[PDB]
């Protein structure tokens, strides 16, 4: 049982993806995660983006588990240097028909009044009280307190590659994060039984949100751009 | 005690390098594992290249191990498209004051006649019958038979980049392979106890081989270039 799919671009009005809040396809194909108008990101914006199908992650009738691998390109743009850029954007998994939750440093993933499991990649640019340096990669599992963390260099403004593998034998979770036009190049993994924290079948996709209105900052702001994405699955039952 | 070395180039008599074999420093500073005369890489031949000092990657007085972070630049250019080139590099970890073992897919670390112990990472360029398709990246283990394989698309000649990070913490080893000329990402990771493995101090460096004449092909090679090299250890103990 092999799930896949590929987007080189987006286009508005695609069947395959389920937007919500704020997220919205440009003219010239790019998936915009947070508000952006007028070429200019805005704050208190929230937005995510899921693949409209439900994928099975693991089985209970022969216990196995699924690998997987997706890649996809992303933009951060930070327009306003000072005080300070706000949010993120993060790659993630959780049970099907779920709502957005909550902005800022929750990425609006994490729901604290109807928590939902999850395991999400992020690339955080906001230091919250919970936070190392910013900006870094970060592995979550159920919280916004990651497991794993990695400091990186943002390229403002160009393009990053990024590359998720999940190995069930090994439990390992590896993403890789590439910026071409630098050449920089940061890794980070760590173990991950997704069989013990997501349900059978599950919805991945992404999230991303600005500067939250009681930080009191307009400037707290980005783009969150996604250019593209290609998802596989496997599930040896 | 953290340990670490830097190589931006070669140059002719590096004191901190041990060559074996075939191995040379080229004029231009290049690395070259494996035998190339008049630019054309021949046939048997088999080289490695040595830190002169050894690394302690555990301590048995407090049981820790080290994490370390080494990243490359390695060229590997194919003038003989037919029948087959062979047979690849090697990043390897062994005891130290070893030999050269056996050429051919052995790369030159592997020694039926008295076999040491060895954890490396081969970029794998000829199909032995104990391979998956070429080429490909493999965990090695003692063996050269890999734990782990993920298949990749070699640049002819193009500059390759590769990050290996081992987290004594989870004890995985990941590896990330990328072409910046094509913009190409492979990674691969897998689950390696080096206390279990390894002695407390040891050697690291590279090992290539080209065609064994056994095969009785010529055309059985390929150039084996190590462009730079950096390595970082940090044993908490
Ligand atoms: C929010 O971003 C604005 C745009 O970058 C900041 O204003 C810019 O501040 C520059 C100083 O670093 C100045 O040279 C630019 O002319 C100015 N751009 C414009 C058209 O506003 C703004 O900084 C605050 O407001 C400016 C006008 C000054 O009064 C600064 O002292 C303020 O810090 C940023 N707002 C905040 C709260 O940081
Ligand atoms: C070993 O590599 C050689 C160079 O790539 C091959 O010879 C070249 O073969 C070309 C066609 O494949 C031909 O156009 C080239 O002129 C020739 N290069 C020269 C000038 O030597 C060689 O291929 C075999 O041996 C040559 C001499 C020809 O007889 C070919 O028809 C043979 O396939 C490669 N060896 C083998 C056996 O693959
Ligand atoms: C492979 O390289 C070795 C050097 O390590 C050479 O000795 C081999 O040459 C062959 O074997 C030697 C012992 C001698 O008989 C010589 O005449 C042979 O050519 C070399 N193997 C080949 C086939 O070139
Ligand atoms: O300003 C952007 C920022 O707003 C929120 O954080 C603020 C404040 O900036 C922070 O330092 C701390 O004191 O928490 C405040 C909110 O209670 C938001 O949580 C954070 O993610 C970011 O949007
Ligand atoms: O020709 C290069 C190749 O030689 C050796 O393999 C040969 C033969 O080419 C191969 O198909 C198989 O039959 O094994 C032979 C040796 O027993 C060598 O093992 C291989 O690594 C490479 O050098
Ligand atoms: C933030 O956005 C919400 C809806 O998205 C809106 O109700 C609220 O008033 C906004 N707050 C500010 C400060 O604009
Ligand atoms: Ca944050
Ligand atoms: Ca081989
Ligand atoms: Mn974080
Ligand atoms: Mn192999």
């Known amino acids: 049982k092999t799930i896949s799919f590929n987007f ?19 003219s010239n194909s790019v998936l915009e995660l ?16 899921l693949y409209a199908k439900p994928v099975q992650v693991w089985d209970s009738t022969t216990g196995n588990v699924a690998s997987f691998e997706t890649r996809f390109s992303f933009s951060i743009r930070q327009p306003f240097p000072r005080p300070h850029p706000a949010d993120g954007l993060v790659f993630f998994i959780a049970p099907p028909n779920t709502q957005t939750g909550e902005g800022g440093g929750y990425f609006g993933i994490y729901n604290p009044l109807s928590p939902y499991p999850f395991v999400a990649v992020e690339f955080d640019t906001f230091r919250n009280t919970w936070d190392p340096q910013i900006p870094h990669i970060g592995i979550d599992v159920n919280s916004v307190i990651s497991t794993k963390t990695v400091p990186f260099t943002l390229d403002n403004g160009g393009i990053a590659n990024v590359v998720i593998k999940y ?71």
């Open 34 to 49: 947070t508000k952006v108008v007028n070429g200019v990101p805005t704050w208190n914006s929230t937005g995510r983006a």
């Open 167 to 237: 190995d069930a034998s090994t439990k390992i979770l590896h993403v890789v994060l590439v910026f071409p036009s630098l050449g920089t190049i940061y890794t980070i993994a760590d173990i991950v039984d997704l069989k013990q924290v997501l349900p059978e079948s599950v919805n991945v996709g992404f999230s991303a949100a600005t500067g939250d209105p009681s930080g009191k900052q307009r400037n707290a702001t980005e783009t969150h751009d996604i250019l593209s994405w290609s998802f596989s699955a496997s599930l040896p039952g």
């Open 8 to 26: 080189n671009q987006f286009h508005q009005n695609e069947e395959q993806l389920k937007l919500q809040r704020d997220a919205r396809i440009s």
